[PDB]
Amino acid sequence: STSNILNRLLVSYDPRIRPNFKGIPVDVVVNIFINSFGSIQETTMDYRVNIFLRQKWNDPRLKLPSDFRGSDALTVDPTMYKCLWKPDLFFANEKSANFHDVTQENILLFIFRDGDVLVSMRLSITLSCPLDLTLFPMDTQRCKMQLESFGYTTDDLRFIWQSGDPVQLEKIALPQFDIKKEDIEYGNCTKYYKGTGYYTCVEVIFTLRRQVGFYMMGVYAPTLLIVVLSWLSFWINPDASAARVPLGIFSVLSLASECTTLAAELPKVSYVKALDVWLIACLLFGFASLVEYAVVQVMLNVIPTAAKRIDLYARALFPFCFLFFNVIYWSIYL
Amino acid sequence: MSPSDFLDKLMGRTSGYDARIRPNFKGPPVNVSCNIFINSFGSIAETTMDYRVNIFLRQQWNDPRLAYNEYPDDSLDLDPSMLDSIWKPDLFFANEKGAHFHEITTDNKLLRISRNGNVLYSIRITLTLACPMDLKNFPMDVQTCIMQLESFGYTMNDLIFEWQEQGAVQVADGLTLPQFILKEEKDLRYCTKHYNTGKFTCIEARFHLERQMGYYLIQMYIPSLLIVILSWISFWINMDAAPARVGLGITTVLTMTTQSSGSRASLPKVSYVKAIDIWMAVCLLFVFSALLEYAAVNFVSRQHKEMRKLFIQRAKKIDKISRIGFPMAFLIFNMFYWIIYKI
Amino acid sequence: MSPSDFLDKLMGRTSGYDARIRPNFKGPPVNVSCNIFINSFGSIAETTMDYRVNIFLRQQWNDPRLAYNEYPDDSLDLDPSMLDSIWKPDLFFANEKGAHFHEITTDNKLLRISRNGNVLYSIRITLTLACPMDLKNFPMDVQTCIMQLESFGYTMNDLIFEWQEQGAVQVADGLTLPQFILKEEKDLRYCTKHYNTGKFTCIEARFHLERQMGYYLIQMYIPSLLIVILSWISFWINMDAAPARVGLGITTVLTMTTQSSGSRASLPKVSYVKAIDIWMAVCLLFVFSALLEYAAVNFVSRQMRKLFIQRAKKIDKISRIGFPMAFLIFNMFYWIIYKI
Amino acid sequence: MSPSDFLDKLMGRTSGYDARIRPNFKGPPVNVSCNIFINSFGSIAETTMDYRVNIFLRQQWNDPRLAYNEYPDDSLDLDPSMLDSIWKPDLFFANEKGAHFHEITTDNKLLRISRNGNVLYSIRITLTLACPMDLKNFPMDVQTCIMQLESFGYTMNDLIFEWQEQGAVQVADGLTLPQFILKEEKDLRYCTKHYNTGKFTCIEARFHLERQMGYYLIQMYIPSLLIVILSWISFWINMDAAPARVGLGITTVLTMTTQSSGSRASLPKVSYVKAIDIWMAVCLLFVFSALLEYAAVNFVSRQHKEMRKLFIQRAKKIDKISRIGFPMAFLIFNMFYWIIYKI
Amino acid sequence: SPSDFLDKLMGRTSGYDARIRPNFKGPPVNVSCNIFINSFGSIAETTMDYRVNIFLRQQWNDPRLAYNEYPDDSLDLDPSMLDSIWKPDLFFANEKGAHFHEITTDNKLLRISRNGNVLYSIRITLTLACPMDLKNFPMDVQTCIMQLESFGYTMNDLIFEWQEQGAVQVADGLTLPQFILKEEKDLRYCTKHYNTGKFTCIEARFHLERQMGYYLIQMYIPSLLIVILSWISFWINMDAAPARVGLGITTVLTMTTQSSGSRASLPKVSYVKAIDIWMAVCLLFVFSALLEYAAVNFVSRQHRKLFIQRAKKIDKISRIGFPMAFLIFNMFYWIIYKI
Ligand SMILES: *[C@@H]1O[C@H](CO)[C@@H](O)[C@H](O)[C@H]1NC(C)=O
Ligand SMILES: *[C@@H]1O[C@H](CO)[C@@H](O)[C@H](O)[C@H]1NC(C)=O
Ligand SMILES: *[C@@H]1O[C@H](CO)[C@@H](O)[C@H](O)[C@H]1NC(C)=O
Ligand SMILES: CCCCCCCCCCC
Ligand SMILES: CCCCCCCCCCC
Ligand SMILES: CCCCCCCCCCC
Ligand SMILES: CCCCCCCCCCC
Ligand SMILES: CCCCCCCCCCC
Ligand SMILES: CCCCCCCCCCC
Ligand SMILES: CCCCCCCCCCC
Ligand SMILES: CCCCCCCCCCC
Ligand SMILES: CCCCCCCCCCC
Ligand SMILES: CCCCCCCCCCC
Ligand SMILES: CCCCCCCCCC
Ligand SMILES: CCCCCCCCC
Ligand SMILES: CCCCCCCCC
Ligand SMILES: CCCCCCCCC
Ligand SMILES: CCCCCCCCC
Ligand SMILES: CCCCCCCCC
Ligand SMILES: CCCCCCCCC
Ligand SMILES: CCCCCCCCC
Ligand SMILES: CCCCCCCCC
Ligand SMILES: CCCCCCCCC
Ligand SMILES: CCCCCCC
Ligand SMILES: CCCCCCC
Ligand SMILES: CCCCCCC
Ligand SMILES: CCCCCCC
Ligand SMILES: CCCCCC
Ligand SMILES: CCCCCC
Ligand SMILES: CCCCCC
Ligand SMILES: CCCCCC
Ligand SMILES: CCCCCC
Ligand SMILES: CCCCCC
Ligand SMILES: CCCCCC
Ligand SMILES: [Cl-]
Ligand SMILES: [Cl-]
């Protein structure tokens, strides 16, 4: 007769009245168990996530009558959940979400003797976080999961994270990120709206780092060795115009083709990035090599023939300048 | 006294309040003071000509039938479950192109009724609004995307929409967009539609958008300039190196062609010419004209012998006049292009 | 005097009105006058053969059972909730391919009843209709996408659809589209499907769509002409600069190949030959023919026996004016056959 | 007359009719003649192996309980709301993979009851049915995609599905398709699935699909043929022109590899070898072998100067034999390829 | 009549409760549930997920629903009354999205036998998720699983168990792009341990293998051909400077454009794959060939004939050195990734 006791308990109960209506504000503890961390879509600035949301509070009106015992916990139907009072909790930065119904309405409700209520439910929320794609290949991103009240001020409703385990992610294996620990703190990040008073809000921050192995091996090394090949034309004889012009021009063509093909594979945003700076610098170095050959040719065409001196200058000018630029680039972007 | 019971008494079967009739029926029009709060502005696309927003749309009006003084509480909240029993304006977006509410753990709708009868109604919406875009000057365009709030069945003499006196539209915190920057100042036009049936109230807020010239100005522009300078390098070579000059010219042509080909993947799918296609075409034409002038000078030089060295002198003269003629022409084109597309 | 109660007394349980019986039952057919108002035309895809629209579909008809005389006001608006309990024509789009209503802050429906029984029923729909596409001449095609309004469970002797006298199909302000420009003229054709069960009423409107000749022209045609002229430049050099001639020819053919390859993504994914592919194939054939001509010249010249050199010079002289004239003939045939 | 009241009298609380009991209960099975009408056949994809259709599925069966004789009108149209409470066959699609109804301005359902109990039930459905596809011979494949209709809760002794004698499956007017041509002939094979519980009725229709060849033919095959012919041309140049021949060979191989890259970009993503990959690989092998044979010729020639003129004659003989071996071998390969992939 | 016999057996007039598990406060109610993969595919590396269609059915004894008066052996039911009977709260631990099928009828079935055994078969479409590791991309073997678990019952109330035979079955010869589903599929027995007790768990593992024909041809073959072309560049006289420079730089360009065109088809991942190593090594070999030509050209020119002799010896020693290095690399690359 577990239905009769809960029915009689909910008789003469108002779902629209929070516990301690004129008393102290109610305390709610929030727990989150992330199942899967969805893939970040850098085009529209969002990331899906599937979580187990567990919020617990106290309700004096739901005190278990002494005549009925049952057990230390009592269960109300996930179809009769609407009879009792539930906090108005919503995610501030989310933009699309839904519940889950695979075989049943997967909402868990427990009512204990002392009056505590345990609520567990599934969600797949597509939160949003602004991503800074500057220093793109080796950046670091932070995304929030701000939970916030909607209808009650701090004088009526308050959210505090569970002391032990706020978030318990276990295995994600992101395609372009990785994380094991995240800042469970910043829970008391409270948002205030003027003319409505303080509004409770709890925030958790996930720190996302990007692996750079593919970009290091897929772009940086080929581009560097292309620049080396561009240098390589300095050692060929000046008279071999038909052999030194193709080397430089095809090095420039290879750089341009690689840049154009790598375009539309990188995120499509319009502002400078570390990879763009590297590519344009390498293209400029190839261009400078070709211009140096042009200067050698115009000097070449008893004449002193002061072109081998230009080649001697270049042989130590180009690698040194490239190494200096590389040192500056890594020191400033890493 | 339970506020739920008090509200049931105020509006219900034994109350006489009708939720299907506007306040001040057959009287003065009811004014609505509505202000929006943009929360997530982004997802701008050019294939479907639309963008997505999240709005904390809150609209205030006065209902004289809601006046009450017996209850001592200054504010009287209403549960979102029973929103069907109270009259609400039928505000709709003329260019919503689709939208939905949010129902995470609770309906994201709020309604509280003041003592004097003022009503607050704040809801959370997700509109994929649509705005036409002009890409005649693509890398330096200034889009103007708007949203319109209108009544559906009520004329001008029944329902009137007016923006709040201060802070009618409030953007959120430092959210960023890909390929766009939202201007911090946005005007509030006082729209109006005059149909045959009468006047329907309409209010619009225009968002000015500014494109970034960054990744664009680097990748789509600097390599083309470098290729043109390489073509001028080909100019600065002796006429005897015919294979070298031919190879340098045709390769520069190939490089410009492959740059133009690869650049199209990132560019929007648009049929009418943009401001970057002109630049690419002019660069390709410059490189082609370089190769053409090399062909001309080679043919003139070969006419000698194949009648004295006057032909060689003429070929040298062609080179001398081209070396300084073509860079100045390119500079003139560059100045005209940047002036016409920036001033 | 309590319009809700008056409407309940007019139609409802106590009035005997039935929501499943058409007006003028077992008698003359009831006419319906519906005028469409396009609000957003766009999202035209050549892959799934569909396009999306917004419609302020308002349809009018006369119901004698709804006529009233005691109420003073001429019109009487109706909430959608009670609109769900009144007879409405089952107008369904013959090629809807999917659609949904709009329910933002209120149901986007409107129903008012006049004194004489005339009722206006304006709703908001977001259709993604389907229209076949003819891309035989891709860059210079004129598509014709249509929508059809038909009844579902009624024949021509019960329900008859017809447009308004003027302004049946209307468009909004100067909305724009990518890769198309909507024609200002849209004829209101008449249709009727003679199924085996009877004659079902039908009305359709045709939207003419013309493709713009902008970006396509410049960045698909101009480089081809430039490469062919570069091949003629290769023609304009002697037969002893063999590395120069070979390099110029092979680089021109590679440039044409990469120009064809790069545009493959931009063009729609179709498997029948289009006008653009003919142009690209002809340009590639021209470049190949130029390279083959140079190969023949080199073979003859490497083949006193100076008459062979004289014959190579004759071949070069002939090809100097042969290729430009052939290209001009092709360019005058192509545009005439595809534009006129 | 009030057909709604007559319908309530015939079936409802005061009639004894049950909506969960099949007609002819505890007796012969009830045949359901169902015929479809394809209205939109498109959106065929290789990534997810499915296609979308729109069907005016109409099915008929006899119900002696619903049979009536007092009412004068032969047909009684019934609205969907009351259709929710009438017995219908438990039909479902064995490979639906997702589907939904259409409810634009009205439910797209039509039920009419004849005098002798015959019931007609036509609805509009949209299905993303799935069909396995093989791309072993991609450009010249013939594909067959089918749809299956089965009972879900009734065995062979209760529900039986049978196509109509004439025009069971029809198609609309001249609808087109990208990359495919729907065959006008479509056989209707019979089906039966013997599960552990018993025998379930099942019927399927096969839609034969051909693939277009013009665009693939031109864009992929023709440039490969031209590049192979250029690689052949690389034989006719003089032996001493080492830069010319090296450049021609390597540029032809670069052209072949960039054509292959473009194809792979524009081809369906499938991990098993198609019929165009063989062609591209063979063309690449041919141009590579031409460059290899030129290298062999150059090596033979070089050792003559570093034997007298014997090696030069050997190199000339190699050129002469290659100039006729390459075209004949390529023709043999082409003949074998087209014979094996067409016959 | 069977229609109201269900009401007589359970409901308002019988007293049966639809929110209490059978054998209340007693032994757990075992549920022998077996699935039937109807359509497997839509595997994507962008979101680490796959989609299935399942004819999930499950049996469990129910003495409350057990009946003996009705002569009929079986007793079917419709979803309308099925919505008022106790069912196990079975949810997938990695569903990532789900929905039923409701075409022309709800795709659900429920029949009750005399002894009380209940059958409950539903058709579901699950977009399950599995982490896929692409360290060795062309020669990987994935392992994607589904986890059926209870939600509001411990192991003292509800216990799941696979069928004794034929628990997981597959449909006819459905074909996937880029994957071949192995016929063998083990059925592990998971069990989650939480602070509130033990929750039931059962999993089925679908081993997946990737075909490598198209990848092999269209990536490995051109790279090997370009390496052979670089060796051809080795096999030329030293004085042919334009020819050798052109050949080397054009081979470098060909390798670069081959890699660039290959980056589009491959999955977009941030860690190094087994094909990126191969492409990088081939490109490095072409670069090394060009560097060797540069060295021999610098030595040969420079300047008696010993310097030119030294250049000839460099060509002689690098003519066969590179093939051996490439063979060694090929044997160490294929052994480490295939064995
Ligand atoms: C959090 O800050 C608020 C004040 O804005 C208040 O509740 C308290 O000082 C802090 N701690 C908790 C647990 O709320
Ligand atoms: C068809 O159905 C009737 C009952 O309606 C049954 O008597 C007959 O045997 C069935 N025949 C077929 C074609 O299965
Ligand atoms: C189910 O298994 C339990 C043991 O876990 C056993 O006690 C019980 O008798 C079995 N039968 C049922 C369905 O209760
Ligand atoms: C957003 C800061 C940009 C700083 C300048 C970057 C210049 C990069 C190009 C240098 C040649
Ligand atoms: C030419 C030197 C390249 C290496 C520079 C390393 C800089 C320090 C990096 C610290 C993470
Ligand atoms: C390709 C760039 C050429 C720049 C000018 C070079 C001039 C060199 C001669 C100075 C006396
Ligand atoms: C497009 C470049 C034109 C250069 C000048 C050509 C002159 C040719 C005639 C010389 C008498
Ligand atoms: C297709 C490659 C051919 C290589 C040269 C073969 C020469 C064989 C004859 C040696 C006397
Ligand atoms: C893969 C390069 C092959 C070069 C030619 C080798 C010839 C060897 C035989 C010489 C008699
Ligand atoms: C498959 C290409 C075959 C090219 C011709 C090879 C000839 C080898 C024998 C030369 C004497
Ligand atoms: C690729 C760079 C080569 C630099 C010159 C190396 C010279 C080595 C020989 C010194 C006697
Ligand atoms: C990367 C190839 C290196 C080949 C050996 C070069 C040796 C140069 C020094 C010779 C004395
Ligand atoms: C039974 C598996 C065989 C894998 C391929 C082995 C290749 C070994 C030779 C590599 C040069
Ligand atoms: C394994 C695919 C076989 C295709 C037909 C035969 C091709 C022969 C090419 C020489
Ligand atoms: C563009 C680079 C020029 C380098 C000149 C070096 C001169 C050394 C004497
Ligand atoms: C003779 C050695 C000259 C080195 C010049 C280095 C210049 C670095 C910017
Ligand atoms: C872009 C036109 C060519 C530059 C003008 C001078 C050409 C030589 C007379
Ligand atoms: C387009 C190629 C023409 C080849 C003509 C050859 C004439 C030989 C006498
Ligand atoms: C329907 C095919 C027409 C092909 C026309 C080719 C014209 C070539 C000049
Ligand atoms: C030489 C091509 C002429 C094309 C004329 C087209 C005219 C269209 C009205
Ligand atoms: C079905 C293939 C037709 C190919 C026509 C080619 C025309 C070239 C001028
Ligand atoms: C050059 C070989 C052509 C082979 C054509 C075969 C056509 C079969 C229908
Ligand atoms: C592809 C194998 C080539 C082997 C060349 C050996 C040369 C020995 C002098
Ligand atoms: C790789 C750089 C070599 C420099 C040599 C300077 C003498
Ligand atoms: C807005 C200023 C533009 C200057 C351009 C100088 C070429
Ligand atoms: C004859 C020299 C062989 C060198 C092999 C290096 C791996
Ligand atoms: C995991 C590292 C593999 C290196 C292979 C080198 C051939
Ligand atoms: C992280 C791997 C780097 C490899 C460089 C060759
Ligand atoms: C580019 C520098 C040239 C210096 C000539 C003396
Ligand atoms: C190619 C140019 C020729 C000019 C003859 C006057
Ligand atoms: C395109 C120029 C042709 C000139 C023929 C004499
Ligand atoms: C069928 C496999 C062919 C491979 C050709 C290199
Ligand atoms: C001498 C002719 C050989 C042909 C080989 C296919
Ligand atoms: C299926 C194996 C193909 C191998 C081609 C070289
Ligand atoms: Cl490319
Ligand atoms: Cl070259």
Numbering used by the authors:
A (entry chain E): 33 to 333, 443 to 475
B (entry chain A), D (entry chain C): 8 to 313, 383 to 419
C (entry chain B): 8 to 310, 383 to 419
E (entry chain D): 9 to 311, 384 to 419
Wording from the paper:
In the absence of glycine (apo state), a single conformation was resolved that corresponds to the closed states. All the orthosteric sites are empty. In our apo structure, all five binding pockets are empty and in the same apo conformation. In the apo state, 5-fold pseudosymmetry is maintained in the whole α1β GlyR, with tightly constricted ion conduction pore.
